[PDB]
Amino acid sequence: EDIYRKEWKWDKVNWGSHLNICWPQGSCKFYVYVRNGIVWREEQAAQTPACNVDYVDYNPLGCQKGSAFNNNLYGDERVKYPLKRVGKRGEGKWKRVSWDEAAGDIADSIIDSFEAQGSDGFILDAPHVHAGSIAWGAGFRMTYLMDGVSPDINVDIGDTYMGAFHTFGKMHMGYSADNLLDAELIFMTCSNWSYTYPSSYHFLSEARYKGAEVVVIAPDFNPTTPAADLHVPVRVGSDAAFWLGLSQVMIDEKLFDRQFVCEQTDLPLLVRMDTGKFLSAEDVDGGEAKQFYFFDEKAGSVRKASRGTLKLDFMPALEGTFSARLKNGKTIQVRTVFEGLREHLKDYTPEKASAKCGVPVSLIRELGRKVAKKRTCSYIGFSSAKSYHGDLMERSLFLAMALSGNWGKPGTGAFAWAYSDDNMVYLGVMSKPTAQGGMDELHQMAEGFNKRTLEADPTSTDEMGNIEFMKVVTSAVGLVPPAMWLYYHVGYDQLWNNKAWTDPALKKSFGAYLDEAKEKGWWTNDHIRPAPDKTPQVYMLLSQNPMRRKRSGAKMFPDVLFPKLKMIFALETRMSSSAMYADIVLPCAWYYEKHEMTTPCSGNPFFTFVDRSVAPPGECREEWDAIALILKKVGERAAARGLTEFNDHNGRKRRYDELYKKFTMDGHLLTNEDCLKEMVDINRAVGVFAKDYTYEKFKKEGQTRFLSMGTGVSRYAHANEVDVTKPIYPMRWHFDDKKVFPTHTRRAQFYLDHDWYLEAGESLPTHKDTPMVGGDHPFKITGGHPRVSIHSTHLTNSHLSRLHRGQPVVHMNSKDAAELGIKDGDMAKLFNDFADCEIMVRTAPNVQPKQCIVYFWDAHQYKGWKPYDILLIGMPKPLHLAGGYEQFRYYFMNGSPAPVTDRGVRVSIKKA
Amino acid sequence: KRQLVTVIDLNKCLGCQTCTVACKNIWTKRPGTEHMRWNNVTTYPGKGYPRDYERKGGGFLRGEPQPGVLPTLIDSGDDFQFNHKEVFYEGKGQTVHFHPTSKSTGKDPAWGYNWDEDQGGGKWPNPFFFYLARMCNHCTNPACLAACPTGAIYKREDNGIVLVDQERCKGHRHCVEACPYKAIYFNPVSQTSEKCILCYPRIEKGIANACNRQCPGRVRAFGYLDDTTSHVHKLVKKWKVALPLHAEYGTGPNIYYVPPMGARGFGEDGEITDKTRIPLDVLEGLFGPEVKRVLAVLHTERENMRAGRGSELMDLLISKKWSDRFGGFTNDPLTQS
Amino acid sequence: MKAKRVPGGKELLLDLDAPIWAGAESTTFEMFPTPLVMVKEVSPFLALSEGHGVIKRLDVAALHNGSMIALRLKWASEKHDKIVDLNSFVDGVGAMFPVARGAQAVTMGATGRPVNAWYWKANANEPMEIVAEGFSAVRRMKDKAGSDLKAVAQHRNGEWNVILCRSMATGDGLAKLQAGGSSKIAFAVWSGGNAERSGRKSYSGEFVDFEILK
Numbered sequence A: 001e002d003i004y005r006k007e008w009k010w011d012k013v014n015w016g017s018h019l020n021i022c023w024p025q026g027s028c029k030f031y032v033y034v035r036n037g038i039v040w041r042e043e044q045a046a047q048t049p050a051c052n053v054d055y056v057d058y059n060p061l062g063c064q065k066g067s068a069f070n071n072n073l074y075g076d077e078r079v080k081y082p083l084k085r086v087g088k089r090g091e092g093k094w095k096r097v098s099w100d101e102a103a104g105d106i107a108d109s110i111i112d113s114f115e116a117q118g119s120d121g122f123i124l125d126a127p128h129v130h131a132g133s134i135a136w137g138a139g140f141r142m143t144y145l146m147d148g149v150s151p152d153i154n155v156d157i158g159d160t161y162m163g164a165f166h167t168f169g170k171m172h173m174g175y176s177a178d179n180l181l182d183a184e185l186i187f188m189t190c191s192n193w194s195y196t197y198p199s200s201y202h203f204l205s206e207a208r209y210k211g212a213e214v215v216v217i218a219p220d221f222n223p224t225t226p227a228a229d230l231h232v233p234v235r236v237g238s239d240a241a242f243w244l245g246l247s248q249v250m251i252d253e254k255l256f257d258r259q260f261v262c263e264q265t266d267l268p269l270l271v272r273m274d275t276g277k278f279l280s281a282e283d284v285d286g287g288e289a290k291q292f293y294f295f296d297e298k299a300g301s302v303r304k305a306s307r308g309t310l311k312l313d314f315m316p317a318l319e320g321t322f323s324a325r326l327k328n329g330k331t332i333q334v335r336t337v338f339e340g341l342r343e344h345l346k347d348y349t350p351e352k353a354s355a356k357c358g359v360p361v362s363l364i365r366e367l368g369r370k371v372a373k374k375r376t377c378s379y380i381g382f383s384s385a386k387s388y389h390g391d392l393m394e395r396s397l398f399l400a401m402a403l404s405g406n407w408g409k410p411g412t413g414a415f416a417w418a419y420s421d422d423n424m425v426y427l428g429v430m431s432k433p434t435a436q437g438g439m440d441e442l443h444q445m446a447e448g449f450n451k452r453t454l455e456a457d458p459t460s461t462d463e464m465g466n467i468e469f470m471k472v473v474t475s476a477v478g479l480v481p482p483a484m485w486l487y488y489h490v491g492y493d494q495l496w497n498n499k500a501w502t503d504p505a506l507k508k509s510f511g512a513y514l515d516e517a518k519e520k521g522w523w524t525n526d527h528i529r530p531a532p533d534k535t536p537q538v539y540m541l542l543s544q545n546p547m548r549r550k551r552s553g554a555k556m557f558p559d560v561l562f563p564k565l566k567m568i569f570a571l572e573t574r575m576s577s578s579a580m581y582a583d584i585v586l587p588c589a590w591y592y593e594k595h596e597m598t599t600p601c602s603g604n605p606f607f608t609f610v611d612r613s614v615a616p617p618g619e620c621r622e623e624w625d626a627i628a629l630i631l632k633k634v635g636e637r638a639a640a641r642g643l644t645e646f647n648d649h650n651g652r653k654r655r656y657d658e659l660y661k662k663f664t665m666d667g668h669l670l671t672n673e674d675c676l677k678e679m680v681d682i683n684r685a686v687g688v689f690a691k692d693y694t695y696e697k698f699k700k701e702g703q704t705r706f707l708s709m710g711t712g713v714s715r716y717a718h719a720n721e722v723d724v725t726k727p728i729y730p731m732r733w734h735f736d737d738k739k740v741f742p743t744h745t746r747r748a749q750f751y752l753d754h755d756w757y758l759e760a761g762e763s764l765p766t767h768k769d770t771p772m773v774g775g776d777h778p779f780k781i782t783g784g785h786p787r788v789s790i791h792s793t794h795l796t797n798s799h800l801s802r803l804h805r806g807q808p809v810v811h812m813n814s815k816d817a818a819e820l821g822i823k824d825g826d827m828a829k830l831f832n833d834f835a836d837c838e839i840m841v842r843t844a845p846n847v848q849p850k851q852c853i854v855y856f857w858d859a860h861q862y863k864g865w866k867p868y869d870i871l872l873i874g875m876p877k878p879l880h881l882a883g884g885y886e887q888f889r890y891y892f893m894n895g896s897p898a899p900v901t902d903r904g905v906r907v908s909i910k911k912a
Numbered sequence B: 001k002r003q004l005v006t007v008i009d010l011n012k013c014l015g016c017q018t019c020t021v022a023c024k025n026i027w028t029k030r031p032g033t034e035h036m037r038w039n040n041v042t043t044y045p046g047k048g049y050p051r052d053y054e055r056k057g058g059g060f061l062r063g064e065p066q067p068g069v070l071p072t073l074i075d076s077g078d079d080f081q082f083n084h085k086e087v088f089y090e091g092k093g094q095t096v097h098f099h100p101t102s103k104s105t106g107k108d109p110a111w112g113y114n115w116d117e118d119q120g121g122g123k124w125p126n127p128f129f130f131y132l133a134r135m136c137n138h139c140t141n142p143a144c145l146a147a148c149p150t151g152a153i154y155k156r157e158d159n160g161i162v163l164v165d166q167e168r169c170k171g172h173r174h175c176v177e178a179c180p181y182k183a184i185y186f187n188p189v190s191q192t193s194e195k196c197i198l199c200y201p202r203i204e205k206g207i208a209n210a211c212n213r214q215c216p217g218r219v220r221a222f223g224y225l226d227d228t229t230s231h232v233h234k235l236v237k238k239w240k241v242a243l244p245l246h247a248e249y250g251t252g253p254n255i256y257y258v259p260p261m262g263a264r265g266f267g268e269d270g271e272i273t274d275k276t277r278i279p280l281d282v283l284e285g286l287f288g289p290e291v292k293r294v295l296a297v298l299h300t301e302r303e304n305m306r307a308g309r310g311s312e313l314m315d316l317l318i319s320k321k322w323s324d325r326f327g328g329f330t331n332d333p334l335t336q337s
Numbered sequence C: 001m002k003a004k005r006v007p008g009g010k011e012l013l014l015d016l017d018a019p020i021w022a023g024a025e026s027t028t029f030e031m032f033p034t035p036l037v038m039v040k041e042v043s044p045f046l047a048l049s050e051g052h053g054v055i056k057r058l059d060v061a062a063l064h065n066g067s068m069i070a071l072r073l074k075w076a077s078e079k080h081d082k083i084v085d086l087n088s089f090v091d092g093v094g095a096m097f098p099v100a101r102g103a104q105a106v107t108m109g110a111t112g113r114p115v116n117a118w119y120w121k122a123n124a125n126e127p128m129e130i131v132a133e134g135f136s137a138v139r140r141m142k143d144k145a146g147s148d149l150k151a152v153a154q155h156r157n158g159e160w161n162v163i164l165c166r167s168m169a170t171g172d173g174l175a176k177l178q179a180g181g182s183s184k185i186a187f188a189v190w191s192g193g194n195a196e197r198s199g200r201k202s203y204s205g206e207f208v209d210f211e212i213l214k
């Protein structure tokens, strides 16, 4: 029996985790087992207790990708030496060069472009955090120091909740997974936790056994349905109709929480029947334009709705049509938003809503009634943001939550998007360490914004002061809406101005709306970068893979962008499909091979330590060090070339020779370990870690619950404090404290009375079918994040690829396939008016008829390297160019039109 | 004499394959074991693992031994080879792509481990499927043991673990044909057969077996069937909600499954019903005639919870403290052999 | 059968194409399927075997040179000399001798009545020495139990040709094969193509006289 006992041996064990952005980030603590100087295997530590005795713990955490990551570290997907292109881009001809040569070529290309046209020539395109918080910090810090252009990561990927943004004025709200244990009714929608949250899926099945009713709203009977009591089989993109049907039920049957609606929302605010706009004090007595009104039926009069608190001292009217005399002496009819909604929901009776979304009447009525009487928590996943009209779908869900009083309470919530990213953003901008006063300027600037805000409006909240700050700082550091440069520089105007692929309720194209928006000053030159008359010349790939990530990027990048680019360089651990087109690939240290910390959110609300268990192989470098070296070389090469200064985008001069000293804080930050210690200090300084929770304690324990959302948007958006003894849930301040919302109406706002919305037919939540993006083809293609990989991190891993068919697959309904003469395992062409791809077919009864599904794959896993994404176009929702309204705005990760609307794109399928 | 048992709660299983990799990354990365998924997880309805194992005979009928047939490498999930060098470095551009090649045929695979993932059964709008984790059952009446003419297979009297003595094994593979679960696997390098060892190197140090311990879905319980304080005893023997897989194969298997409740289906009228869509006879095919009772108990107990009455059963199946699932096998996985 | 004395060295006896083999006394043995119903108590599953024993004829010549003794064995078979799948088996041949009085070939001997078998497998470098006390106790000897048993093999034109060669003098427990002595011999042969291994095979039946001449 000693031959198996032989295997159960090792030399040492360290803490590890994975920096790939699973979401909610699992932040799973592993034992990393090293032997013979190599990572042999890993296993979950399972040391994450419950919040208290009544709740389920988080143990063991983990997933199959994490639990087999040792295979990544020794896999043939790794790049271990700097490579320089030998053939054409993408030809697969490489030679090894030194870091010196590779960093030198990169630096020269940076210099060349800065000399030719200033800093607009450099693009760090939407890096994600997969390489690590410190790598993200490095890339951002670099771009900021150089005043380069960094398209917004979140808008670029399509992880946003614009309907939340537009209803509540914020989206950075979340709950922790154990919050489901306090819900009586749980809706998993536009999401697939079986695939996408395996570390905490258990809270869903365990809530079920505790008595929670679990509902999966999905077009397909999706992989999460084994935990579900009910599948709500929506037609792709039709969720609004479902949720409006539910709202109609609660209103018609008088099941709604009248008090909550009257307090929390715009439903009782009065709207003018002549203009369609909220009745304002300006209209009535020449007061404030944003002072709005309730009707007091007892008093027989319009009464000002407070801008400063949601607390009510009487019950506003909901039902009715009334009159108001304006300052003109003219009398008009006014009615509450609610009264308009009652009319509007006549088109969403269960019978009618059922016709629109394909959900049976019985289920619409059952769930209408249940939502009104049950503490209800949802998880809206990021397929919502990837739907053209996800905002409408989300607004409609929030209307049902409003009507049922389902927010601001234990066991409520909609997603997990509250998090502290202080460790990354302070690392990214500070000129000196935290312990040396590095946060002082930022912290005094933050106060400035608060003072200015209160001055503008003394009813303003901290949350509002923080948003104004965010709007400014985002543009000061070169973070820009990604639609702009894609439109102006990557030829996407030719796709996005196609009226055939636009919502037909819109009166004009995306670009026409853009022109109107810039004419009105809603987008400035600090948003539209690189400027249209600049040419992108240097393009940095870091935790980003545009060949699959950009919708239609597989065509638009090679055909339009790459030809303009003098240098494409990648900081990679792995030979991604996009790295195959690079001029220079720089090898990086991977998980367990560099000190790091995970980047958790509310869902799994603990930071986890990642040790350097083993040295990186070959000439793999930490990304901070790699970037530091590039910047030193920029300085050195500039000096050798007799150059001193370059112009930033505002035409101010910056010295090449100070880039490296600034980046490293004059030698203080050279390694991940250096940066980790600084991130720990940052977390201590902002309350995310206890003040006495040092790096020494962190290294020893391996993980710790965070104690706050830090100092960024989440701290205010989340609108609750973190109490580690109970599940995290948002919006408590709004409900308990009657705190106003940062919106036009100061309330959770279902009526958007902005001209564009009024004209588009979207002033109220409403159902619009997905635009016919791709042309008139009969399937609606949907996707999802892969079960089998965290993004592409494991898509080129032999070991993990043996858990599946090892290649791209399209899931089709069995009968649909049969009707096209296609069998399981056949190849098929997917195509539309724009492009095509070939993919292996999986047939399943669980796919909705005329739906097909591709969970994403890396582009070089496909024939001709044409991924399904090639046909996805990414039509941005033009209404998201809107400004001139409080909650219509852009700051980092929030707002602007996301080019991400791939869910429901039209494709045809034929056998190949 | 005692018997180690595992309970697997199919309601909780999310098909993540962590258990698959947990096993593989200790035991089955050695030459000749790469195809072996001693812990395997596939979608049900499906062909299972190995492919069509339910058609391959073995076991006992009326206590009569049944002939069986040997799985192939492909049946056993293959060991896909990939072409990294070809795609990245060979100057072939987009004329080649990253893809698997069968280790058996040297060509593109038309099957492999978990090939029928997420497919399942039923008919729209009532499709159904769940995930089915399996390992060696460490049977009370093991057919594998009975089959080996060299007597290389034995069942530990202390804990009921069934093992193939790797020194005496000659690779005759009668055991493979005889095991109606096809839970013994030929190693063509050693030319012996191998199988789940119930992680005995770990369990003899009080460390839970890896496929149980590493399951993020908290699906798995483990322990001695006679230990009246254990989850496994309470679910198999007391509540009797954890049922054997294919007990009609005559081997007395010692893994037990909590059958899936499943999602409510739609009726012929297209309206929502109050009944699961999973056909009872399908679940009965796998877990026997007690399925109906079990589903009824699960629903009743779940209602007891919901109503504020409490339920030991729901407490057990939820297990708010994870380590309580493991029957006293609670040592951290930090003691070596 | 008789093993004839020949004047050569071991590289006449190990040379499959040596003309000396062309003048050897060759005996054709009919080969029958093993009565596996007999193995029920050792393996009820093996006892269910159907269709084993597809090789019906084995030709054997025996020669010695006083210090080594060689068997040349020849039979019709496809070449299965490699494990190419998890269901794949290799060709094999066995020659058995009694090591105790009253050892019966049809049971592979019995407790205290052992037999010794030379065992060749097509995918093995070396042949194996097997000592058996009944088919319930068939042992492969570690590193041949000190024996110098050697094999050469070639498949050509649909036939296996193999020579099993061993020193005439051996230690205790292996078959006594002295010049001027008479032992007994039996054979089994396995078709890998027919999934033959362990007891699934054809065999020559009970032991026949094996006279070692000179």
Ligand SMILES: Nc1nc2c(c(=O)[nH]1)N[C@@H](/C(S)=C(/S)[C@H](O)COP(=O)(O)OP(=O)(O)OC[C@H]1O[C@@H](n3cnc4c(=O)[nH]c(N)nc43)[C@H](O)[C@@H]1O)C=N2
Pocket (backbone or CB within 6 Å): A019, A020, A128, A130, A131, A132, A156, A157, A158, A159, A382, A386, A542, A543, A544, A545, A546, A548, A549, A550, A571, A572, A573, A574, A575, A576, A588, A589, A590, A591, A623, A783, A784, A785, A790, A791, A792, A793, A856, A869, A872, A902
């Ligand atoms: N149709 C469709 N499109 C969608 C989505 C969808 O659901 N459907 N979803 C999205 C969303 S939400 C995301 S977050 C994208 O998958 C993220 O794409 P990304 O390009 O970052 O991933 P990817 O994994 O491909 O590239 C990241 C690279 O990071 C590398 N990497 C990972 N770890 C490290 C590391 O430690 N160091 C370094 N230097 N690199 C590392 C990785 O190799 C990969 O190539 C976006 N589009």
Ligand SMILES: Nc1nc2c(c(=O)[nH]1)N[C@H]1C(S)=C(S)[C@@H](COP(=O)(O)OP(=O)(O)OC[C@H]3O[C@@H](n4cnc5c(=O)[nH]c(N)nc54)[C@H](O)[C@@H]3O)O[C@H]1N2
Pocket (backbone or CB within 6 Å): A021, A022, A023, A024, A159, A189, A190, A191, A192, A193, A195, A196, A197, A217, A218, A219, A220, A222, A223, A234, A235, A236, A237, A238, A239, A380, A381, A382, A383, A387, A782, A783, A784, A785, A786, A787, A788, A789, A790, A791, A903
């Ligand atoms: N294994 C793994 N997990 C991950 C990641 C990963 O790459 N791998 N990435 C992380 C990241 S960055 C993200 S953004 C998340 C994403 O994870 P989720 O937020 O869960 O989102 P998706 O995977 O897009 O959700 C897929 C589901 O959307 C449903 N769907 C599609 N269209 C519609 C529709 O119109 N209506 C409704 N109701 N549903 C629809 C489909 O049924 C599909 O199953 O995953 C996170 N976790």
Ligand code: HEM
Pocket (backbone or CB within 6 Å): B149, B150, B151, B170, C034, C035, C036, C038, C039, C042, C046, C094, C095, C096, C105, C106, C107, C108, C117, C118, C119, C130, C135, C136, C137, C138, C139, C140, C186, C187, C188, C198, C199, C203, C204, C205
């Ligand atoms: C008379 C000529 C025979 C010869 C030369 C012979 C030879 C052998 C040899 C060399 C082995 C070992 C195979 C291995 O280790 O892989 C073996 C195994 C076996 N034989 Fe025979 N045998 C003969 C007759 C029989 C008969 C008539 C039976 C059945 C009635 C039989 C039943 C078995 C069984 C059941 C095994 C497997 C035992 C084990 O591997 O431990 N043998 N035989």
Ligand code: SF4
Pocket (backbone or CB within 6 Å): A017, A018, A020, A022, A025, A026, A027, A028, A061, A062, A063, A064, A065, A066, A067, A199, A790
């Ligand atoms: S990849 Fe994410 S979910 Fe998986 S083990 Fe690592 S941190 Fe956990």
Ligand code: SF4
Pocket (backbone or CB within 6 Å): B135, B136, B137, B138, B139, B141, B142, B143, B144, B145, B162, B178, B179, B180, B181, B182, B183, B184, B195, B251
């Ligand atoms: S499952 Fe198969 S291999 Fe495991 S003990 Fe039972 S009969 Fe033997």
Ligand code: SF4
Pocket (backbone or CB within 6 Å): B022, B023, B024, B027, B038, B039, B135, B136, B195, B196, B197, B198, B199, B209, B210, B211, B212
């Ligand atoms: S008990 Fe251990 S050896 Fe058996 S399948 Fe699980 S991990 Fe593998």
Ligand code: SF4
Pocket (backbone or CB within 6 Å): B012, B013, B014, B015, B016, B017, B018, B019, B020, B041, B131, B133, B214, B215, B216, B217, B218, B219, B220
């Ligand atoms: S690890 Fe658990 S949840 Fe995941 S597949 Fe295995 S048994 Fe199911």
Ligand code: F3S
Pocket (backbone or CB within 6 Å): B147, B148, B149, B150, B151, B152, B153, B164, B168, B169, B170, B171, B172, B173, B174, B175, B176, B192, B193
């Ligand atoms: S039959 Fe016996 S010899 Fe080995 S392969 Fe099976 S244990």
Ligand SMILES: [Mo]
Pocket (backbone or CB within 6 Å): A023, A157, A159, A382
């Ligand atoms: Mo994402």
